[PDB]
Design a protein around this motif. Structure first.
Motif, short mmCIF file in Angstrom:
data_model
loop_
_atom_site.label_atom_id
_atom_site.label_comp_id
_atom_site.label_asym_id
_atom_site.label_seq_id
_atom_site.Cartn_x
_atom_site.Cartn_y
_atom_site.Cartn_z
N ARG A 59 61.79 40.17 87.13
CA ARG A 59 61.00 41.12 86.37
C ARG A 59 61.49 41.23 84.96
N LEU A 60 60.57 41.33 84.01
CA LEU A 60 60.91 41.69 82.65
C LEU A 60 60.70 43.18 82.44
N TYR A 61 61.64 43.81 81.76
CA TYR A 61 61.57 45.24 81.52
C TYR A 61 60.67 45.54 80.34
N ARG A 62 59.71 46.43 80.53
CA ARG A 62 58.87 46.88 79.42
C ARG A 62 59.58 48.05 78.79
N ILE A 63 59.86 48.01 77.52
CA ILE A 63 60.56 49.16 76.96
C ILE A 63 59.54 50.25 76.71
N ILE A 64 59.81 51.46 77.20
CA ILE A 64 58.74 52.43 77.11
C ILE A 64 59.25 53.64 76.32
N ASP A 65 58.32 54.39 75.75
CA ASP A 65 58.63 55.39 74.74
C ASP A 65 58.67 56.74 75.41
N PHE A 66 59.88 57.27 75.65
CA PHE A 66 60.03 58.54 76.33
C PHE A 66 60.34 59.66 75.38
N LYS A 67 60.45 59.40 74.10
CA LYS A 67 60.41 60.41 73.06
C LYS A 67 59.12 60.15 72.33
N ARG A 68 58.22 61.12 72.26
CA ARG A 68 57.07 60.77 71.42
C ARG A 68 57.16 61.38 70.01
N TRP A 69 58.21 62.17 69.73
CA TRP A 69 58.28 63.03 68.56
C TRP A 69 58.77 62.31 67.33
N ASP A 70 59.23 61.08 67.47
CA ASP A 70 59.56 60.37 66.25
C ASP A 70 58.33 59.69 65.65
N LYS A 71 57.14 59.90 66.21
CA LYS A 71 55.86 59.58 65.60
C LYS A 71 55.01 60.80 65.31
N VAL A 72 55.58 61.99 65.16
CA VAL A 72 54.72 63.18 65.03
C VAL A 72 53.58 62.98 64.03
N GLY A 73 52.36 63.30 64.46
CA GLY A 73 51.19 63.26 63.63
C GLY A 73 50.50 61.91 63.57
N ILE A 74 51.21 60.82 63.76
CA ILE A 74 50.58 59.51 63.62
C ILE A 74 49.72 59.20 64.84
N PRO A 75 48.39 59.16 64.75
CA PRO A 75 47.58 58.86 65.94
C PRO A 75 47.72 57.41 66.36
N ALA A 76 47.27 57.16 67.59
CA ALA A 76 47.25 55.80 68.08
C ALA A 76 46.05 55.59 68.99
N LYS A 77 45.64 54.33 69.09
CA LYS A 77 44.55 53.90 69.94
C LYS A 77 45.12 53.41 71.27
N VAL A 78 44.40 53.64 72.36
CA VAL A 78 44.87 53.11 73.63
C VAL A 78 44.26 51.70 73.72
N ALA A 79 45.11 50.68 73.62
CA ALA A 79 44.66 49.29 73.54
C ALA A 79 44.46 48.67 74.91
N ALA A 80 45.31 49.03 75.86
CA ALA A 80 45.32 48.39 77.18
C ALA A 80 45.98 49.33 78.14
N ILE A 81 45.66 49.12 79.40
CA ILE A 81 46.44 49.69 80.47
C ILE A 81 47.04 48.53 81.23
N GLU A 82 48.36 48.58 81.45
CA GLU A 82 49.10 47.42 81.93
C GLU A 82 49.93 47.74 83.17
N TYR A 83 50.28 46.68 83.88
CA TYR A 83 51.09 46.77 85.09
C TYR A 83 52.57 46.58 84.75
N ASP A 84 53.36 47.64 84.83
CA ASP A 84 54.80 47.55 84.67
C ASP A 84 55.40 47.47 86.05
N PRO A 85 56.11 46.40 86.41
CA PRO A 85 56.80 46.34 87.70
C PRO A 85 58.05 47.22 87.79
N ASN A 86 58.55 47.77 86.71
CA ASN A 86 59.77 48.54 86.82
C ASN A 86 59.51 49.99 87.16
N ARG A 87 58.26 50.35 87.45
CA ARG A 87 57.93 51.71 87.82
C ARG A 87 56.68 51.72 88.69
N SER A 88 56.48 52.86 89.34
CA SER A 88 55.30 53.12 90.13
C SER A 88 54.11 53.47 89.26
#
Ligand SMILES: NC[C@H]1O[C@H](O[C@H]2[C@H](O[C@@H]3O[C@H](CO)[C@@H](O)[C@H](N)[C@H]3O)[C@@H](O)[C@H](N)C[C@@H]2N)[C@H](N)[C@@H](O)[C@@H]1O
Ligand SMILES: [Mg+2]
Ligand SMILES: [Mg+2]
Ligand SMILES: [Mg+2]
Ligand SMILES: [Mg+2]
Ligand SMILES: [Mg+2]
Ligand SMILES: [Mg+2]
Ligand SMILES: [Mg+2]
Ligand SMILES: [Mg+2]
Ligand SMILES: [Mg+2]
Ligand SMILES: [Mg+2]
Ligand SMILES: [Mg+2]
Ligand SMILES: [Mg+2]
Ligand SMILES: [Mg+2]
Ligand SMILES: [Mg+2]
Ligand SMILES: [Mg+2]
Ligand SMILES: [Mg+2]
Ligand SMILES: [Mg+2]
Ligand SMILES: [Mg+2]
Ligand SMILES: [Mg+2]
Ligand SMILES: [Mg+2]
Ligand SMILES: [Mg+2]
Ligand SMILES: [Mg+2]
Ligand SMILES: [Mg+2]
Ligand SMILES: [Mg+2]
Ligand SMILES: [Mg+2]
Ligand SMILES: [Mg+2]
Ligand SMILES: [Mg+2]
Ligand SMILES: [Mg+2]
Ligand SMILES: [Mg+2]
Ligand SMILES: [Mg+2]
Ligand SMILES: [Mg+2]
Ligand SMILES: [Mg+2]
Ligand SMILES: [Mg+2]
Ligand SMILES: [Mg+2]
Ligand SMILES: [Mg+2]
Ligand SMILES: [Mg+2]
Ligand SMILES: [Mg+2]
Ligand SMILES: [Mg+2]
Ligand SMILES: [Mg+2]
Ligand SMILES: [Mg+2]
Ligand SMILES: [Mg+2]
Ligand SMILES: [Mg+2]
Ligand SMILES: [Mg+2]
Ligand SMILES: [Mg+2]
Ligand SMILES: [Mg+2]
Ligand SMILES: [Mg+2]
Ligand SMILES: [Mg+2]
Ligand SMILES: [Mg+2]
Ligand SMILES: [Mg+2]
Ligand SMILES: [Mg+2]
Ligand SMILES: [Mg+2]
Ligand SMILES: [Mg+2]
Ligand SMILES: [Mg+2]
Ligand SMILES: [Mg+2]
Ligand SMILES: [Mg+2]
Ligand SMILES: [Mg+2]
Ligand SMILES: [Mg+2]
Ligand SMILES: [Mg+2]
Ligand SMILES: [Mg+2]
Ligand SMILES: [Mg+2]
Ligand SMILES: [Mg+2]
Ligand SMILES: [Mg+2]
Ligand SMILES: [Mg+2]
Ligand SMILES: [Mg+2]
Ligand SMILES: [Mg+2]
Ligand SMILES: [Mg+2]
Ligand SMILES: [Mg+2]
Ligand SMILES: [Mg+2]
Ligand SMILES: [Mg+2]
Ligand SMILES: [Mg+2]
Ligand SMILES: [Mg+2]
Ligand SMILES: [Mg+2]
Ligand SMILES: [Mg+2]
Ligand SMILES: [Mg+2]
Ligand SMILES: [Mg+2]
Ligand SMILES: [Mg+2]
Ligand SMILES: [Mg+2]
Ligand SMILES: [Mg+2]
Ligand SMILES: [Mg+2]
Ligand SMILES: [Mg+2]
Ligand SMILES: [Mg+2]
Ligand SMILES: [Mg+2]
Ligand SMILES: [Mg+2]
Ligand SMILES: [Mg+2]
Ligand SMILES: [Mg+2]
Ligand SMILES: [Mg+2]
Ligand SMILES: [Mg+2]
Ligand SMILES: [Mg+2]
Ligand SMILES: [Mg+2]
Ligand SMILES: [Mg+2]
Ligand SMILES: [Mg+2]
Ligand SMILES: [Mg+2]
Ligand SMILES: [Mg+2]
Ligand SMILES: [Mg+2]
Ligand SMILES: [Mg+2]
Ligand SMILES: [Mg+2]
Ligand SMILES: [Mg+2]
Ligand SMILES: [Mg+2]
Ligand SMILES: [Mg+2]
Ligand SMILES: [Mg+2]
Ligand SMILES: [Mg+2]
Ligand SMILES: [Mg+2]
Ligand SMILES: [Mg+2]
Ligand SMILES: [Mg+2]
Ligand SMILES: [Mg+2]
Ligand SMILES: [Mg+2]
Ligand SMILES: [Mg+2]
Ligand SMILES: [Mg+2]
Ligand SMILES: [Mg+2]
Ligand SMILES: [Mg+2]
Ligand SMILES: [Mg+2]
Ligand SMILES: [Mg+2]
Ligand SMILES: [Mg+2]
Ligand SMILES: [Mg+2]
Ligand SMILES: [Mg+2]
Ligand SMILES: [Mg+2]
Ligand SMILES: [Mg+2]
Ligand SMILES: [Mg+2]
Ligand SMILES: [Mg+2]
Ligand SMILES: [Mg+2]
Ligand SMILES: [Mg+2]
Ligand SMILES: [Mg+2]
Ligand SMILES: [Mg+2]
Ligand SMILES: [Mg+2]
Ligand SMILES: [Mg+2]
Ligand SMILES: [Mg+2]
Ligand SMILES: [Mg+2]
Ligand SMILES: [Mg+2]
Ligand SMILES: [Mg+2]
Ligand SMILES: [Mg+2]
Ligand SMILES: [Mg+2]
Ligand SMILES: [Mg+2]
Ligand SMILES: [Mg+2]
Ligand SMILES: [Mg+2]
Ligand SMILES: [Mg+2]
Ligand SMILES: [Mg+2]
Ligand SMILES: [Mg+2]
Ligand SMILES: [Mg+2]
Ligand SMILES: [Mg+2]
Ligand SMILES: [Mg+2]
Ligand SMILES: [Mg+2]
Ligand SMILES: [Mg+2]
Ligand SMILES: [Mg+2]
Ligand SMILES: [Mg+2]
Ligand SMILES: [Mg+2]
Ligand SMILES: [Mg+2]
Ligand SMILES: [Mg+2]
Ligand SMILES: [Mg+2]
Ligand SMILES: [Mg+2]
Ligand SMILES: [Mg+2]
Ligand SMILES: [Mg+2]
Ligand SMILES: [Mg+2]
Ligand SMILES: [Mg+2]
Ligand SMILES: [Mg+2]
Ligand SMILES: [Mg+2]
Ligand SMILES: [Mg+2]
Ligand SMILES: [Mg+2]
Ligand SMILES: [Mg+2]
Ligand SMILES: [Mg+2]
Ligand SMILES: [Mg+2]
Ligand SMILES: [Mg+2]
Ligand SMILES: [Mg+2]
Ligand SMILES: [Mg+2]
Ligand SMILES: [Mg+2]
Ligand SMILES: [Mg+2]
Ligand SMILES: [Mg+2]
Ligand SMILES: [Mg+2]
Ligand SMILES: [Mg+2]
Ligand SMILES: [Mg+2]
Ligand SMILES: [Mg+2]
Ligand SMILES: [Mg+2]
Ligand SMILES: [Mg+2]
Ligand SMILES: [Mg+2]
Ligand SMILES: [Mg+2]
Ligand SMILES: [Mg+2]
Ligand SMILES: [Mg+2]
Ligand SMILES: [Mg+2]
Ligand SMILES: [Mg+2]
Ligand SMILES: [Mg+2]
Ligand SMILES: [Mg+2]
Ligand SMILES: [Mg+2]
Ligand SMILES: [Mg+2]
Lengths: 273, 47
Positions: A59-88
């Motif tokens: 398995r390759l680890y997907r690095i995921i963003d568990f602090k969202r506050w270092d982007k305060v205010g900057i919007p983002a688009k949801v580009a994809a929904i993906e399958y991470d094997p390192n979590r349910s």
RNA sequence: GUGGGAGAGGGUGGUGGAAUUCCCGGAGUAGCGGUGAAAUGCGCAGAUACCGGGAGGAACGCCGAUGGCGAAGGCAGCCACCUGGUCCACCCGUGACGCUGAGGCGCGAAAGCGUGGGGAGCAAACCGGAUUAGAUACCCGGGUAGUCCACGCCCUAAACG
RNA sequence: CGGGGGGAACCUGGGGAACUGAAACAUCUCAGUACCCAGAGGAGAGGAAAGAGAAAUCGACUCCCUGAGUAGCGGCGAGCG
RNA sequence: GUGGUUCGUGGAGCCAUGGGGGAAUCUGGGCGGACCACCGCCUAAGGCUAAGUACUCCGGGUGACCGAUAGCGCACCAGUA
RNA sequence: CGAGCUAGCCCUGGCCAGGGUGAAGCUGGGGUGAGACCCAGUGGAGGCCCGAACCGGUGGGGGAUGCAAACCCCUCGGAUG
RNA sequence: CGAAUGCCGGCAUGAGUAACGAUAAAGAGGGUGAGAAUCCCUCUCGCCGUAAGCCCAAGGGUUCCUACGCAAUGGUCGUCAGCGUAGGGUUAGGCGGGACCUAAGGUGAAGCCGAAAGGCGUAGCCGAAGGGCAGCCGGUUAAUAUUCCGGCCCUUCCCGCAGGUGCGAUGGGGGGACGCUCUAGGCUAGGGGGACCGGAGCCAUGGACGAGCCCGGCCAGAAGCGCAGGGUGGGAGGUAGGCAAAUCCGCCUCCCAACAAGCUCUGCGUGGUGGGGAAGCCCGUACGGGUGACAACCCCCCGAAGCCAGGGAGCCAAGAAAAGCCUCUAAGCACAACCUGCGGGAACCCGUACCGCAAACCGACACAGGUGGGCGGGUGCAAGAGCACUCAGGCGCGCGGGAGAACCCUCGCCAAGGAACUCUGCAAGUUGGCCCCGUAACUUCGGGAGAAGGGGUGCUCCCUGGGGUGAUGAGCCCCGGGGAGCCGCAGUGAACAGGCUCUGGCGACUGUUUACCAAAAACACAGCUCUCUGCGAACUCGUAAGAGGAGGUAUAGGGAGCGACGCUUGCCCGGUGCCGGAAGGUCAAGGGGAGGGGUGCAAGCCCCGAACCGAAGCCCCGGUGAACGGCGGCCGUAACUAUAACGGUCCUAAGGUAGCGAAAUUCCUUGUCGGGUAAGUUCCGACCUGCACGAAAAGCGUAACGACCGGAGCGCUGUCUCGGCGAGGGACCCGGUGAAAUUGAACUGGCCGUGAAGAUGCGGCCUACCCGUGGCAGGACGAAAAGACCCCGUGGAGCUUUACUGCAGC
RNA sequence: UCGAUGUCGGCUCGUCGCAUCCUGGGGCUGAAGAAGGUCCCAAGGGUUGGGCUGUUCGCCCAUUAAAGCGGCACGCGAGCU
RNA sequence: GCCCGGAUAGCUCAGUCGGUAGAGCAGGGGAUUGAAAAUCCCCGUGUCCUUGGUUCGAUUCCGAGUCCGGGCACCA
């Protein structure tokens, strides 16, 4: 919801596979994947410190963003929904407008195409992270920081969530997935929604090998062993526990409570599992 | 059938070799003992 | 067809106050409960009664009627959406296009069943206290499935006028 | 400018067993031994009294003889000294 | 709290010290086997210091020491085959 | 001192003749108010089947100062996990 | 020293005995030599041929090649050799590895921890069968060759010239860069055929001078071109993100191309050129050389699992890194530098012999064992790496000659019978491939199924359907359909290739296990339940630092039991455990000091010390059963009898519910009854008097599955009645080589007695000339192993616990 | 006899005893005959095949002149199982 | 075969410091009822298993015997 299989083998009668409908993108975001070093349950001595682990798909680890506050205010688009094997859960890929890409853990109902944002601002809507203190009482939420700035901790797992029951002082009262009633700091971040992939708890692995794919080697009962090995080893043919049922290390395994009683965090908990 | 000695030159040097013995106080006293006894080889020959 | 009407008809999403229970804080003391009468039970480790805060589920008092709506089963706080049947009026259109209906297909109270959720109150089973000759009952104290939600089953009924 | 690594045994310091004995065994014994480690040196340690201990005494430390298997210690046992 | 000593908690001092508290500078302090008095002894909390001592890889001398199954494992190309 | 045997795990590679069975899906047809669903064709799933390599070690016979300190012959288990 | 299964050594016994290591197999002629079954050569014979041939990697380390040798090594022999002695032999810018990269792991500036030793650890560094990187074909040596030579290609470094350009890195970015199963198209490897091309020679033995037979008809190759295929948008504007900067990348917007169109990369084909080149005959080569030859060098077909390659599709379990490389900019420099093209120069170190499924490696051995990767031809059999034969190639296994007893092993056949054999059909046998027909209970609807049970199968001629390649045609190749006949005992004619049914137990299943006496009903398994755990999680390892858990977060993780699925899983909380309980009891150090005591003239110094305050634990209250666990007895009673729905009473925390039951459990026991058999201690079905079932140490069932374990039947058999005959390898004889355990010494009979109670050895009788060979096993209380059972020892060790005492941990 | 005397049963192979199962010879008979009963002599020879169970034994089927009882380390594992 | 318990009213059972032995049910007599039950009021009673012994006195203590309940019979 859970593909089934005609029983054209044994073990294909009860096997059950995830429904992968929500999955938009079938290979991960190369700048967001780092390799992870399979432990096999062994520590930095060479010693097994967690039993019955190993094997199992690379398995390759997907690095995921568990602090969202270092982007305060900057919007983002949801580009994809993906399958991470390192979590349910599933990960949603975010394209931010300043061009940064990050992986968020994918909430229920969050659809590709949507705009998402984090901060004391931001609508109370699925995907938006905020300090807890600004989220209206009664809201279900996930990916909650436990202490401020230290990263999402509670309700990350497929289907889980957490609910704001009240405010007291600098803290807010959540009911955790476990049902514990916890205080958490008002400044802690949380993103609104449940986690989704809720169907996950209903998969039926269906055979031995499928456990082995997930990196879980067979588990042997103390009863199956000899007295050198286990408080339950030995005894001629079968035999019951013969003593209060215990772990291999001798401590009792029905009801004996293991939480350290003097823990500082005790001031902050109101309930149980 | 498959027996116990399965010679492999990197294994031998990596395991019983001079740099290994030196690496560890146990190992350095092997060398001290084998010197004090006058062993001709202090370490398996390997290669 | 046109214009109008009434209604707890149905599916969905929301939402309100009364009450019960549990928890927290306060105050306060010796009993509370319960019954034919009692006991079990609860209570000085501070019960009951009272006030303040909170949590949670279920059911909607008055209106309410011997009333309304539905083909039946059934349907009752409030709000919106979606949607069925229906009645009247004017006499405008089609021109017998109708009635019934073996089979079929769909609906179908409660209990039950599967997989999840949820669980305050109630409560088969079960425990305990009474009563009795006994009492696997009626009464009392507990109490689990269930009752509630989603999906799928079951297809029964004094499903009756 | 120095350190590092080696050396038969000897030395000191840090750590430190069990068999055994106790005709069983745990305190005790074996024994501060074996052994591991660090360090010394041709030796090392120790040393110039906040000492002995009963004499109004003796004078740094080390080593031998003696004191003496005494004084004592001791499941007042084995034994230790 | 424990080690040292002959002292195994004993009437248990002395020396050391992991923990707590925590002084004084001669009219100060330690000690003479709990403690107190009296009478003595000694001056802690810095350091160094030959020799007398231990050992024997090494050289030498000497044996009522061996003499090739002995004497070192090895008299010989042995810590070897 | 050992995991050069053996057990687990970790990293990185390699190997598995040939045949059979024919899941979902897809397409077409039928069905319906719409559906469920049915049929055909396609499709090629699986700790699926048969069987070499490979991994085994079932039963029997031989061997038993062996060819072998576990072997040989016949037979037999798995063989995309 | 005479004993210690003593120690060391020497030599015996067994004995000319077992054996001489796969039953693939030999025979003759010639040579050599003191000596020849064993060495060389020839001819014949046989064995391997998905190997027993060939090529890599490990490992081995001169075993390689040659001369001269045979003491010893060689299971015999040896003139030979993997042996002795000596000489020779391994050639690389391109193959492999290193002056490249990173992986697990290792190490480790910073840093953390630990009595010492040490332990950890970010960066970095090391680390490869992965990533990156430039050589193909042939010739030559007794022995090396992608290494030397020949031919044709190519890489990097340095320096120079020309042309181009904001150059520039350890920094930013792209790429490298990835799974499993399936698979398209075009190729190549490889193979088959050809009446065409080339070629020595051949016509036997009845026939054939033939469109005869036999042999071969290729290899490599820059640019260019062709076929196939991989990669890839172009432009502008904005821009706050990629820890500085960026013109790059990312993100938004607009405009073009949608397509390999182009650009690019790679396969294959062709290509200047270069090389090879059979059979057969001859030369003597030990081994090759000569010729064949000016060799030919071409068509068709089959065709990869290899190549194009980062191809395509689908699926879930979601599939390394870093450098090389491209791009961007930063100091800095822009005379530098870099890019491209051409030229010269420069290009180091280690490996290279030989063995390599084995006589050279791992197994004390020239050991029937073990050892990773590649290649592995033809024909036939449905296929195939299977089987039989066979090519290239390699071998006949380092004792032989004979005989033709018992007996043994491996093997073939057998009248009648057909399981009567035996613990058991153990063993053997039957069956056996493919095509068609056909196929039950039951079922979770997949299965059961290859159920079962049948039919077909060869060759010849005639006719005929579709496909691949060619052109839509011939030819070649593939898949068939129909008709008429021929032969034998028999046509999957040899080899490879299920016996089947019924019915129980157990375990759902595929898996796993006691390396080397157990493969199973044991473990595991999906799945169900309890429990702990809010995250610096619980838990584990560690003195610690650290680490696993987990870069996870209660749909998660640990622990425990149960073990697919189905229908279910009752009652007891007295005791133990766990869980809860701010009260009460008890409780250690500490606090506190009423009181007392020692000493001193005193002040004082010193000692003891009641009350009271004072944790966890325990007591106490309560909860808790998929927590440890437990789940009665006696007497009476019905209008025949018998039984007892019913009653009484003692006890208990509560007295076993459903279901099941003589059972993997039933003692009595072969219970009783029924079934099956002529006969049934087993088996099946019932009954219930359950010694001593029973619900997650789960209860009762269950289709499917099983090298598990019962019981029955069919089929077929040398299992048996009941043995016979045959084969080969031993046994036997002769020549060569030549062990072993064992052994007080032996001049070593039978009986009846006796004896320490089972006598060759003592008594009395009896029998008995000396010595061998092949055989059998009754005895030598035969051998082997200082009984493993049993006891003893104030012997040991593993295990347990509410045994004692401690320690970790809490 | 523990520095080893292998232990049930089956198979093979016997051999002996006689307290005789059968055959041979007898006496008594509550012996008409035939067939029995009982006791005596007698060990030459004979003494079946199957079902069940590891079984010895025993029960049962079908036969028979009969379907004998014992010893031989409960004969016999350097003879097998 | 070897150890353990028990034997008390018709039934099931308590109890004893060695001296006057009880509970429940059954049973007997009355009441209630039309009559049975249920209910109510009275009520006795056994040589405390046998047999020896201790003692003043034995259901009580002692040792044996019955019969019943329990547990055991292991290593070969
Ligand atoms: N098929 C069309 C419609 O037919 C009826 O509506 C009628 C409608 O009824 C109303 O329905 C509502 C639904 O319950 C109610 O809110 C009103 N009380 C009631 O008056 C009449 O007020 C109109 N005049 C005629 C209309 N056809 C059905 N009732 C509707 O549901 C349906 O959508
Ligand atoms: Mg490590
Ligand atoms: Mg380590
Ligand atoms: Mg795998
Ligand atoms: Mg689950
Ligand atoms: Mg599911
Ligand atoms: Mg698991
Ligand atoms: Mg398990
Ligand atoms: Mg076990
Ligand atoms: Mg232990
Ligand atoms: Mg262990
Ligand atoms: Mg244990
Ligand atoms: Mg146990
Ligand atoms: Mg048991
Ligand atoms: Mg067990
Ligand atoms: Mg060895
Ligand atoms: Mg290597
Ligand atoms: Mg040397
Ligand atoms: Mg009209
Ligand atoms: Mg219904
Ligand atoms: Mg209902
Ligand atoms: Mg209630
Ligand atoms: Mg009533
Ligand atoms: Mg409930
Ligand atoms: Mg009605
Ligand atoms: Mg010391
Ligand atoms: Mg130190
Ligand atoms: Mg220690
Ligand atoms: Mg002694
Ligand atoms: Mg002792
Ligand atoms: Mg002793
Ligand atoms: Mg002892
Ligand atoms: Mg000591
Ligand atoms: Mg000196
Ligand atoms: Mg004393
Ligand atoms: Mg004593
Ligand atoms: Mg001492
Ligand atoms: Mg001491
Ligand atoms: Mg003492
Ligand atoms: Mg002392
Ligand atoms: Mg003093
Ligand atoms: Mg101190
Ligand atoms: Mg003073
Ligand atoms: Mg002092
Ligand atoms: Mg003094
Ligand atoms: Mg004194
Ligand atoms: Mg002094
Ligand atoms: Mg000195
Ligand atoms: Mg000598
Ligand atoms: Mg000597
Ligand atoms: Mg001599
Ligand atoms: Mg000698
Ligand atoms: Mg010697
Ligand atoms: Mg020498
Ligand atoms: Mg290993
Ligand atoms: Mg398939
Ligand atoms: Mg398979
Ligand atoms: Mg292969
Ligand atoms: Mg292997
Ligand atoms: Mg076998
Ligand atoms: Mg086995
Ligand atoms: Mg055998
Ligand atoms: Mg044998
Ligand atoms: Mg041995
Ligand atoms: Mg198979
Ligand atoms: Mg001797
Ligand atoms: Mg001899
Ligand atoms: Mg002999
Ligand atoms: Mg012989
Ligand atoms: Mg022989
Ligand atoms: Mg041979
Ligand atoms: Mg010959
Ligand atoms: Mg072949
Ligand atoms: Mg070797
Ligand atoms: Mg040599
Ligand atoms: Mg020789
Ligand atoms: Mg020889
Ligand atoms: Mg040999
Ligand atoms: Mg040589
Ligand atoms: Mg250089
Ligand atoms: Mg590196
Ligand atoms: Mg380290
Ligand atoms: Mg490499
Ligand atoms: Mg290279
Ligand atoms: Mg090339
Ligand atoms: Mg070549
Ligand atoms: Mg060569
Ligand atoms: Mg640039
Ligand atoms: Mg071909
Ligand atoms: Mg021609
Ligand atoms: Mg002719
Ligand atoms: Mg011609
Ligand atoms: Mg920047
Ligand atoms: Mg690709
Ligand atoms: Mg691809
Ligand atoms: Mg500048
Ligand atoms: Mg070479
Ligand atoms: Mg060889
Ligand atoms: Mg082999
Ligand atoms: Mg190989
Ligand atoms: Mg050989
Ligand atoms: Mg071999
Ligand atoms: Mg060898
Ligand atoms: Mg075939
Ligand atoms: Mg092939
Ligand atoms: Mg026959
Ligand atoms: Mg037959
Ligand atoms: Mg059988
Ligand atoms: Mg068989
Ligand atoms: Mg049938
Ligand atoms: Mg069947
Ligand atoms: Mg089928
Ligand atoms: Mg068939
Ligand atoms: Mg079948
Ligand atoms: Mg023919
Ligand atoms: Mg055949
Ligand atoms: Mg075969
Ligand atoms: Mg066959
Ligand atoms: Mg078959
Ligand atoms: Mg059975
Ligand atoms: Mg199984
Ligand atoms: Mg299996
Ligand atoms: Mg097992
Ligand atoms: Mg085994
Ligand atoms: Mg073993
Ligand atoms: Mg098996
Ligand atoms: Mg289950
Ligand atoms: Mg720890
Ligand atoms: Mg830690
Ligand atoms: Mg971690
Ligand atoms: Mg982690
Ligand atoms: Mg777990
Ligand atoms: Mg189990
Ligand atoms: Mg079923
Ligand atoms: Mg309980
Ligand atoms: Mg309890
Ligand atoms: Mg309780
Ligand atoms: Mg307390
Ligand atoms: Mg309690
Ligand atoms: Mg009666
Ligand atoms: Mg029972
Ligand atoms: Mg039964
Ligand atoms: Mg039976
Ligand atoms: Mg039983
Ligand atoms: Mg029985
Ligand atoms: Mg039965
Ligand atoms: Mg239960
Ligand atoms: Mg249980
Ligand atoms: Mg069952
Ligand atoms: Mg079954
Ligand atoms: Mg099996
Ligand atoms: Mg049978
Ligand atoms: Mg035979
Ligand atoms: Mg023969
Ligand atoms: Mg005799
Ligand atoms: Mg004599
Ligand atoms: Mg005599
Ligand atoms: Mg003889
Ligand atoms: Mg014999
Ligand atoms: Mg014998
Ligand atoms: Mg012995
Ligand atoms: Mg004793
Ligand atoms: Mg002992
Ligand atoms: Mg014995
Ligand atoms: Mg013997
Ligand atoms: Mg007669
Ligand atoms: Mg007569
Ligand atoms: Mg007569
Ligand atoms: Mg006779
Ligand atoms: Mg049998
Ligand atoms: Mg017997
Ligand atoms: Mg019997
Ligand atoms: Mg006997
Ligand atoms: Mg016998
Ligand atoms: Mg025998
Ligand atoms: Mg035997
Ligand atoms: Mg036997
Ligand atoms: Mg009694
Ligand atoms: Mg009347
Ligand atoms: Mg009396
Ligand atoms: Mg009496
Ligand atoms: Mg035993
Ligand atoms: Mg025992």
């Amino acid at each position: 919801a859970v593909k089934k299989f005609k029983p054209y083998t044994p073990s294909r009668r009860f096997m059950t596979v995830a429904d992968f409908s929500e999955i938009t993108k079938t290979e991960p975001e190369k700048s967001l994947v780092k390799p992870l070093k399979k432990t096999g349950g062994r520590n930095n001595q060479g010693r097994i410190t967690v039993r019955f682990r190993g094997g199992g798909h690379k398995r390759l680890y997907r690095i995921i963003d568990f602090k969202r506050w270092d982007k305060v205010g900057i919007p983002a688009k949801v580009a994809a929904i993906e399958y991470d094997p390192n979590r349910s859960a599933r990960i949603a890929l975010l394209h931010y407008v300043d061009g940064e890409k990050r992986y968020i853990i994918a909430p229920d109902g969050l659809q590709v195409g949507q705009q998402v944002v984090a901060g004391p601002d931001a609508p109370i809507q699925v995907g938006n992270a905020l300090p807890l203190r600004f989220i209206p009482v009664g809201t279900v939420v996930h990916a909650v920081e436990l202490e401020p700035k230290k990263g999402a901790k509670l309700a990350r797992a497929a289907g889980t969530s957490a609910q704001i029951q009240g405010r007291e002082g600098d803290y807010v009262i959540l009911r955790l997935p476990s049902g514990e009633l916890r205080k958490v700091h008002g400044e802690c971040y949380a993103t609104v929604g449940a986690v989704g992939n809720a169907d996950h708890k209903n998969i039926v692995l269906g055979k031995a090998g499928r456990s082995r794919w997930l990196g879980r080697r067979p588990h042997v009962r103390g009863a199956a062993m000899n007295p050198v090995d286990h408080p339950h080893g030995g005894g001629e043919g079968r035999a019951p526990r013969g003593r209060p049922p215990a772990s291999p290390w001798g401590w009792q395994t029905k009801g004996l409570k293991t939480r350290k009683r003097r823990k500082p965090s005790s001031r902050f908990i109101i309930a149980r599992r | 059938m498959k027996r116990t000695w399965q010679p492999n030159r990197r294994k031998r040097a990596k395991t019983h070799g001079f740099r290994a013995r030196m690496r560890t106080p146990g190992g350095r006293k092997v060398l001290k003992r084998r010197r004090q006894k006058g062993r001709w080889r202090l370490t398996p020959a390997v290669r």
